[PDB]
Amino acid sequence: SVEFQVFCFTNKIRRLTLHLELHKKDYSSQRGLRKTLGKRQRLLAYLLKINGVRYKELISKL
Amino acid sequence: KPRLVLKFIWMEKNIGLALDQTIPGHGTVPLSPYYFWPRKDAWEELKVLLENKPWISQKQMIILLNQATDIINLWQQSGGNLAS
Amino acid sequence: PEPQCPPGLRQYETMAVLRPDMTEDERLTLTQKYEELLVAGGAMYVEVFNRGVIPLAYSIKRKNKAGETNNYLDGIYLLFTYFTKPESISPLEAALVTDDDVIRSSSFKIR
Amino acid sequence: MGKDTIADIITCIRNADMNRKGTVRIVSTNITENIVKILLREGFIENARKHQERNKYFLVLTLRHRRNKKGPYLNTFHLKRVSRPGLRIYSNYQRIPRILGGMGIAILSTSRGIMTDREARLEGIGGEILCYIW
Amino acid sequence: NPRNNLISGQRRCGKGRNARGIITARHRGGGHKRLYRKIDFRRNEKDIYGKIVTIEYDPNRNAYICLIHYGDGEKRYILHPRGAIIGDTIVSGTEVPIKMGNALPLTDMPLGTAIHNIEITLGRGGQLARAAGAVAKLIAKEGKSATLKLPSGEVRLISKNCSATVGQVGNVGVNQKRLGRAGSKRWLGKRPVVRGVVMNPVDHPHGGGEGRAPIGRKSPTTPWGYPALGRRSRKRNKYSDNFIIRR
Amino acid sequence: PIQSGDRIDYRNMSLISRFISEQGKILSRRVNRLTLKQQRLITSAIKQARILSLLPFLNNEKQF
RNA sequence: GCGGUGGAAACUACCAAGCUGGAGUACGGUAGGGGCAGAGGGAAUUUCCGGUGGAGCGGUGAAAUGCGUAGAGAUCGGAAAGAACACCAACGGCGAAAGCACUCUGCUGGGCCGACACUGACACUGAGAGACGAAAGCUAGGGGAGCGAAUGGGAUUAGAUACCCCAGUAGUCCUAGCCGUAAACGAUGGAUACUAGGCGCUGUGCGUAUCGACCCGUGCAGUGUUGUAGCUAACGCGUUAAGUAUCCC
């Protein structure tokens, strides 16, 4: 299941970001946010590598 | 849990205290450790060995320590005097 | 009987020691601030049972409201096996620091 | 399952018999099957057996020995890769080497299949030299 | 809402300096009219709530002030503390719980608390620690006094039945608001001060001669002859209420 | 030994105080002969009971 | 060498379609000084305030400067202050490294293990780039007990800007930044696959044994110590290679 990985990582970045911006100095979870961004980004380049229209739907969903 | 023997020896210069210890619910073999002629601590060495065991109950550790203490005590008095 | 409700929120247990003098408004008023916790928490709040007063090791420094007087050797050992949301535990800490008959209140989180 | 499936088999051969163990377990892909097919028939090894463990067909391969010696195999096997991934090598039917005069062979990928120097020198075809053993 | 009919209007004219007309508080004059704000220091309405609707800039102060209403029909201004959420409710009284913004007498409260507006005796409006960040703490209380560490590094046992507005008073960032326009000193009604070396011997005791004159006297003095370093200007027997100067 | 099934809490002052000395200080794993997990868990529990003044921080020295 | 043209399809690439052991996710557990924030703690030290008592205390290789009849130090009580957190502490656990240990709470990272529960190669490395980055340093504001560059005095010394001693400022701590270096060391870039063992530790999993804690073997992951092969100039390293190979900087 791929779109649950992208969507799940998106909610991960939402909850972790609204953690981090009202907190502002945790330099440990910064790596977690950046590993999630990079991991999701290699997924988006993967599904963009496979398809057009379907990845256009992944952009249009979020 | 078997039960226990300190053996002391007094010769004028030198104490030895020798702690022979015994088994808990876990089958173990102690020696008798003999603590030695130089001024290096006998009670601390003995008691610490017992505490390191936990295999020794408090009553057991204490009774042997009391006997050990008594001999070190007699030894100190004889060394300060000449008893022999 | 306790694993019924912890779908949804958390579980704690607060240890709080008391004055040794008073016998009245001690089971009463601290259960009334436990009802203040009931306005806050509202979950399976049971087993708020009391432990007998015994001599502790060493304690000073009551800090009454402008008293700063009493040394102690004894104290009533309350412990609340309560159950709440993880939100609003710091107001339980302020409630169990500021009040007079509660000194040295350490909460915990049993698993 | 690393980068190479041929340094897979080959490094399992070198690491197999440099510790004198006469038994190899490797994956059985198409080109591994072809190499052990053109390698059992050339006297280097003894037997290759396919089987399965979790329905994954593998090759266990029995190496050669001799009798009770200081080391029970005298001639050290000396396997070597040539066409590394990222540096492909290619030869005509001129360059195709007689290894040590012929005591080694150079297994290589023709358009026919994969041959040796005997079976690609008579053909006159050339191709990508996988590796040569000696 | 300006022109509140609480700005109270008539004053003594600007930043005045005239006793009989003689310059007696020096370097004053200039600036705007600076109409004052009659604010409510001594809260004479206890145990009735009141919201906060406006943080107005008082030009008389270093801090801001705020307009507070009531459940009854009144309007006052008080010093808002740090943390004045707009719409938040303040209430004076004797048993009102401690919140950043409300007032209570100095007895019914714990020790070790941030309070700005305290009273030195009963009946007065408001004396101590009311600047733009002036915060006074409480050391423990006594029978009819209360040792209070006010923002000078100075402690003072005080009458315990004095009103006090608990909170740290806001607008702290005037520690760093630079006056770098270099004529903005004159906008506050503060004329430039001349220096004692460059005056004449009829004016200042350090009226010199040729060149940048060294200070000449055994001590650097005021323009009226008293030594201006270390000489404590305090009557020897006034109150004896302060514990230690701690300065 | 002495695990006794129920987990070690500050409320269990039976197996606790078999682990401190009469001088009131925590004994190591090789003396008490437990696992690492038992040792750390009684460590945190003993220091909790140290907060509640159930246990002394120092016991006054004695002879005779 | 380049070009034209006719053939081959194993390998790279390409086109299409499946596959799962690579990689992830979902789930259930699990361990942790991972990080940050908030509360709370008690020894000890210093200073102050009291009661006692009266001549030294402190220090050293030996002395001295210092402090002390204005009552020192010592002892008991009372406060306050900051900083660090004894035993536990282990050849231990975690982090990517730097680092991380008084306890508790909150938010949150990461790891490990199982079932096929899902997708189907999504993988590795990474120029330039970006982040973090011990200590000392600097800007701004707090705070300042101990320790303590500079400094000052005493001593040793031919001399002493030094080792010793007595005072002692910046600094040490915290907030917000800058700085971006260290023997930042495992003196060992990362990743995958394969190649004896013995003795260990940590985390989980299965079976035995009891039916419950053990206890034995093990499946893995991580950490350590001797060590075969092989490598090495040697010392040594040796499944966590400095071995055999492949890739990337």
Tab-separated table of N, CA, C and O in Angstrom, chain D residues 44-105:
chain	number	residue	atom	x	y	z
D	44	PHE	N	36.459	-28.846	-13.209
D	44	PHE	CA	36.834	-28.045	-12.056
D	44	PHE	C	36.101	-28.487	-10.801
D	44	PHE	O	36.708	-28.610	-9.733
D	45	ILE	N	34.809	-28.755	-10.909
D	45	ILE	CA	33.999	-29.102	-9.752
D	45	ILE	C	33.494	-30.526	-9.931
D	45	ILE	O	33.824	-31.190	-10.919
D	46	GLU	N	32.710	-31.024	-8.977
D	46	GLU	CA	32.254	-32.404	-9.020
D	46	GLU	C	30.784	-32.523	-9.397
D	46	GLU	O	30.449	-33.208	-10.365
D	47	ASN	N	29.892	-31.874	-8.658
D	47	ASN	CA	28.468	-32.028	-8.891
D	47	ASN	C	27.771	-30.731	-8.538
D	47	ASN	O	28.189	-30.007	-7.634
D	48	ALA	N	26.695	-30.453	-9.259
D	48	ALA	CA	25.796	-29.362	-8.933
D	48	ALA	C	24.395	-29.924	-8.786
D	48	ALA	O	23.933	-30.684	-9.643
D	49	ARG	N	23.725	-29.559	-7.703
D	49	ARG	CA	22.402	-30.075	-7.404
D	49	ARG	C	21.469	-28.909	-7.146
D	49	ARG	O	21.766	-28.051	-6.309
D	50	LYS	N	20.360	-28.869	-7.875
D	50	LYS	CA	19.282	-27.957	-7.540
D	50	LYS	C	18.405	-28.575	-6.470
D	50	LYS	O	18.202	-29.790	-6.445
D	51	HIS	N	17.898	-27.736	-5.574
D	51	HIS	CA	16.784	-28.142	-4.716
D	51	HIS	C	16.011	-26.893	-4.316
D	51	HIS	O	16.106	-25.850	-4.969
D	52	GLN	N	15.215	-27.011	-3.264
D	52	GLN	CA	14.424	-25.904	-2.763
D	52	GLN	C	14.461	-25.923	-1.245
D	52	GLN	O	14.718	-26.958	-0.627
D	53	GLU	N	14.266	-24.753	-0.651
D	53	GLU	CA	14.240	-24.615	0.798
D	53	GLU	C	12.950	-23.980	1.282
D	53	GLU	O	12.343	-24.456	2.246
D	54	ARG	N	12.541	-22.889	0.652
D	54	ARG	CA	11.229	-22.280	0.789
D	54	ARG	C	10.691	-22.020	-0.612
D	54	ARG	O	10.329	-20.902	-0.989
D	55	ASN	N	10.740	-23.086	-1.423
D	55	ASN	CA	10.413	-23.073	-2.854
D	55	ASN	C	11.283	-22.076	-3.613
D	55	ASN	O	10.821	-21.381	-4.520
D	56	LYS	N	12.553	-21.999	-3.226
D	56	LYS	CA	13.531	-21.125	-3.862
D	56	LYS	C	14.684	-22.008	-4.313
D	56	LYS	O	15.450	-22.506	-3.484
D	57	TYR	N	14.802	-22.202	-5.621
D	57	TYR	CA	15.616	-23.283	-6.164
D	57	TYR	C	17.083	-22.886	-6.109
D	57	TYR	O	17.477	-21.881	-6.704
D	58	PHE	N	17.887	-23.651	-5.373
D	58	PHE	CA	19.276	-23.306	-5.121
D	58	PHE	C	20.201	-24.358	-5.703
D	58	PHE	O	19.790	-25.481	-6.015
D	59	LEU	N	21.469	-23.977	-5.812
D	59	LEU	CA	22.540	-24.846	-6.277
D	59	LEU	C	23.485	-25.129	-5.126
D	59	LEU	O	24.085	-24.204	-4.572
D	60	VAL	N	23.620	-26.394	-4.766
D	60	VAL	CA	24.704	-26.828	-3.904
D	60	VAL	C	25.711	-27.533	-4.786
D	60	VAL	O	25.342	-28.357	-5.628
D	61	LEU	N	26.974	-27.183	-4.616
D	61	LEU	CA	28.020	-27.497	-5.565
D	61	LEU	C	29.181	-28.098	-4.800
D	61	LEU	O	29.655	-27.512	-3.825
D	62	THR	N	29.631	-29.259	-5.238
D	62	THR	CA	30.676	-29.999	-4.550
D	62	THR	C	31.999	-29.773	-5.260
D	62	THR	O	32.122	-30.052	-6.456
D	63	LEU	N	32.981	-29.274	-4.521
D	63	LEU	CA	34.271	-28.956	-5.097
D	63	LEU	C	35.160	-30.181	-5.138
D	63	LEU	O	34.872	-31.217	-4.538
D	64	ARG	N	36.261	-30.049	-5.856
D	64	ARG	CA	37.175	-31.160	-5.984
D	64	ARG	C	38.173	-31.159	-4.840
D	64	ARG	O	38.426	-30.145	-4.188
D	65	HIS	N	38.727	-32.333	-4.596
D	65	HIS	CA	39.734	-32.519	-3.588
D	65	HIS	C	40.684	-33.572	-4.104
D	65	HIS	O	40.736	-33.871	-5.299
D	66	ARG	N	41.443	-34.120	-3.183
D	66	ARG	CA	42.328	-35.205	-3.428
D	66	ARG	C	42.370	-35.890	-2.086
D	66	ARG	O	41.393	-35.895	-1.330
D	67	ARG	N	43.472	-36.463	-1.778
D	67	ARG	CA	43.444	-37.206	-0.595
D	67	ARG	C	44.038	-36.410	0.588
D	67	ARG	O	44.225	-35.210	0.470
D	68	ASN	N	44.249	-37.035	1.775
D	68	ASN	CA	44.633	-36.418	3.022
D	68	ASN	C	46.022	-35.858	2.833
D	68	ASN	O	47.008	-36.600	2.788
D	69	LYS	N	46.086	-34.547	2.702
D	69	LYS	CA	47.348	-33.877	2.489
D	69	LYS	C	47.528	-32.812	3.555
D	69	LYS	O	46.769	-32.770	4.531
D	70	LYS	N	48.555	-31.975	3.389
D	70	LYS	CA	48.616	-30.726	4.137
D	70	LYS	C	47.403	-29.865	3.824
D	70	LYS	O	46.812	-29.259	4.722
D	71	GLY	N	47.016	-29.815	2.553
D	71	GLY	CA	45.716	-29.348	2.140
D	71	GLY	C	45.147	-30.309	1.116
D	71	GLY	O	45.793	-30.619	0.110
D	72	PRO	N	43.918	-30.791	1.345
D	72	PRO	CA	43.379	-31.900	0.531
D	72	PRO	C	43.112	-31.568	-0.929
D	72	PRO	O	42.756	-32.476	-1.684
D	73	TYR	N	43.251	-30.319	-1.351
D	73	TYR	CA	43.241	-29.975	-2.762
D	73	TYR	C	44.557	-29.284	-3.090
D	73	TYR	O	44.960	-28.334	-2.411
D	74	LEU	N	45.254	-29.798	-4.099
D	74	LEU	CA	46.593	-29.300	-4.391
D	74	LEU	C	46.524	-28.031	-5.225
D	74	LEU	O	47.010	-26.972	-4.811
D	75	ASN	N	45.914	-28.123	-6.402
D	75	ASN	CA	45.817	-26.992	-7.314
D	75	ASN	C	44.792	-26.004	-6.776
D	75	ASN	O	43.594	-26.301	-6.730
D	76	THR	N	45.271	-24.844	-6.338
D	76	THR	CA	44.382	-23.793	-5.871
D	76	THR	C	43.575	-23.270	-7.056
D	76	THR	O	44.071	-23.202	-8.182
D	77	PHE	N	42.311	-22.942	-6.806
D	77	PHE	CA	41.326	-22.845	-7.871
D	77	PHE	C	41.457	-21.562	-8.675
D	77	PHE	O	41.308	-21.598	-9.897
D	78	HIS	N	41.687	-20.429	-7.999
D	78	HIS	CA	42.047	-19.136	-8.599
D	78	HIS	C	40.985	-18.625	-9.580
D	78	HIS	O	41.191	-18.566	-10.786
D	79	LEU	N	39.835	-18.273	-9.037
D	79	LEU	CA	38.774	-17.716	-9.851
D	79	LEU	C	38.916	-16.198	-9.862
D	79	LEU	O	39.319	-15.605	-8.863
D	80	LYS	N	38.582	-15.564	-10.983
D	80	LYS	CA	38.743	-14.121	-11.117
D	80	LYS	C	37.679	-13.543	-12.036
D	80	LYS	O	37.435	-14.099	-13.103
D	81	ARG	N	37.085	-12.414	-11.646
D	81	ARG	CA	36.205	-11.653	-12.525
D	81	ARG	C	36.976	-10.764	-13.485
D	81	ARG	O	38.125	-10.396	-13.244
D	82	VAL	N	36.327	-10.422	-14.601
D	82	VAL	CA	36.886	-9.437	-15.517
D	82	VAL	C	35.900	-8.318	-15.815
D	82	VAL	O	36.175	-7.158	-15.502
D	83	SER	N	34.755	-8.630	-16.425
D	83	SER	CA	33.860	-7.548	-16.839
D	83	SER	C	33.055	-7.115	-15.638
D	83	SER	O	31.956	-7.600	-15.391
D	84	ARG	N	33.624	-6.184	-14.896
D	84	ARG	CA	32.970	-5.600	-13.749
D	84	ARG	C	31.740	-4.820	-14.194
D	84	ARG	O	31.702	-4.296	-15.306
D	85	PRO	N	30.700	-4.770	-13.369
D	85	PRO	CA	29.621	-3.823	-13.636
D	85	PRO	C	30.158	-2.410	-13.501
D	85	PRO	O	30.829	-2.073	-12.527
D	86	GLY	N	29.912	-1.609	-14.512
D	86	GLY	CA	30.455	-0.288	-14.578
D	86	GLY	C	31.715	-0.177	-15.400
D	86	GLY	O	32.088	0.936	-15.781
D	87	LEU	N	32.391	-1.294	-15.667
D	87	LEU	CA	33.446	-1.348	-16.683
D	87	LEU	C	33.217	-2.625	-17.483
D	87	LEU	O	33.759	-3.684	-17.163
D	88	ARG	N	32.409	-2.527	-18.522
D	88	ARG	CA	32.152	-3.686	-19.351
D	88	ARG	C	33.326	-3.906	-20.287
D	88	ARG	O	33.897	-2.954	-20.824
D	89	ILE	N	33.700	-5.161	-20.474
D	89	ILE	CA	34.756	-5.496	-21.412
D	89	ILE	C	34.122	-6.264	-22.563
D	89	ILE	O	33.082	-6.912	-22.408
D	90	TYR	N	34.694	-6.112	-23.749
D	90	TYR	CA	34.161	-6.766	-24.930
D	90	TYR	C	35.321	-7.145	-25.825
D	90	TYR	O	36.261	-6.367	-25.993
D	91	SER	N	35.246	-8.327	-26.411
D	91	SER	CA	36.320	-8.830	-27.242
D	91	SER	C	35.768	-9.347	-28.556
D	91	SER	O	34.650	-9.857	-28.623
D	92	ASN	N	36.584	-9.235	-29.595
D	92	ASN	CA	36.304	-9.856	-30.878
D	92	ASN	C	36.703	-11.327	-30.814
D	92	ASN	O	37.011	-11.862	-29.747
D	93	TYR	N	36.754	-12.004	-31.956
D	93	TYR	CA	37.308	-13.347	-31.952
D	93	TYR	C	38.815	-13.329	-32.148
D	93	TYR	O	39.427	-14.387	-32.306
D	94	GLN	N	39.428	-12.149	-32.121
D	94	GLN	CA	40.876	-12.040	-32.101
D	94	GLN	C	41.411	-11.941	-30.681
D	94	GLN	O	42.298	-12.707	-30.298
D	95	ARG	N	40.868	-11.012	-29.894
D	95	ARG	CA	41.408	-10.708	-28.574
D	95	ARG	C	41.216	-11.849	-27.580
D	95	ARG	O	42.018	-11.961	-26.646
D	96	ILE	N	40.216	-12.708	-27.791
D	96	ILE	CA	39.782	-13.782	-26.887
D	96	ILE	C	40.932	-14.656	-26.396
D	96	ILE	O	41.595	-15.347	-27.181
D	97	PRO	N	41.246	-14.600	-25.110
D	97	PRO	CA	42.570	-15.033	-24.664
D	97	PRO	C	42.651	-16.521	-24.382
D	97	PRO	O	41.727	-17.134	-23.848
D	98	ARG	N	43.787	-17.102	-24.752
D	98	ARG	CA	44.142	-18.437	-24.290
D	98	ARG	C	44.797	-18.274	-22.929
D	98	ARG	O	45.949	-17.854	-22.830
D	99	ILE	N	44.062	-18.596	-21.875
D	99	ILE	CA	44.534	-18.347	-20.522
D	99	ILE	C	45.591	-19.377	-20.169
D	99	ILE	O	45.306	-20.576	-20.155
D	100	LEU	N	46.805	-18.899	-19.888
D	100	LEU	CA	47.981	-19.712	-19.559
D	100	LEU	C	48.306	-20.724	-20.650
D	100	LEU	O	48.810	-21.810	-20.372
D	101	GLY	N	48.017	-20.379	-21.897
D	101	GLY	CA	48.126	-21.307	-22.991
D	101	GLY	C	46.900	-22.160	-23.215
D	101	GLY	O	46.724	-22.692	-24.312
D	102	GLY	N	46.041	-22.287	-22.220
D	102	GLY	CA	44.846	-23.084	-22.345
D	102	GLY	C	44.465	-23.759	-21.049
D	102	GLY	O	43.366	-24.306	-20.945
D	103	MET	N	45.351	-23.719	-20.048
D	103	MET	CA	45.062	-24.351	-18.765
D	103	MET	C	43.945	-23.668	-18.000
D	103	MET	O	43.352	-24.289	-17.118
D	104	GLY	N	43.646	-22.411	-18.312
D	104	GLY	CA	42.446	-21.759	-17.848
D	104	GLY	C	41.462	-21.605	-18.993
D	104	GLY	O	41.770	-21.852	-20.154
D	105	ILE	N	40.245	-21.211	-18.639
D	105	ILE	CA	39.205	-20.950	-19.618
D	105	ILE	C	38.595	-19.595	-19.321
D	105	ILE	O	38.641	-19.100	-18.195
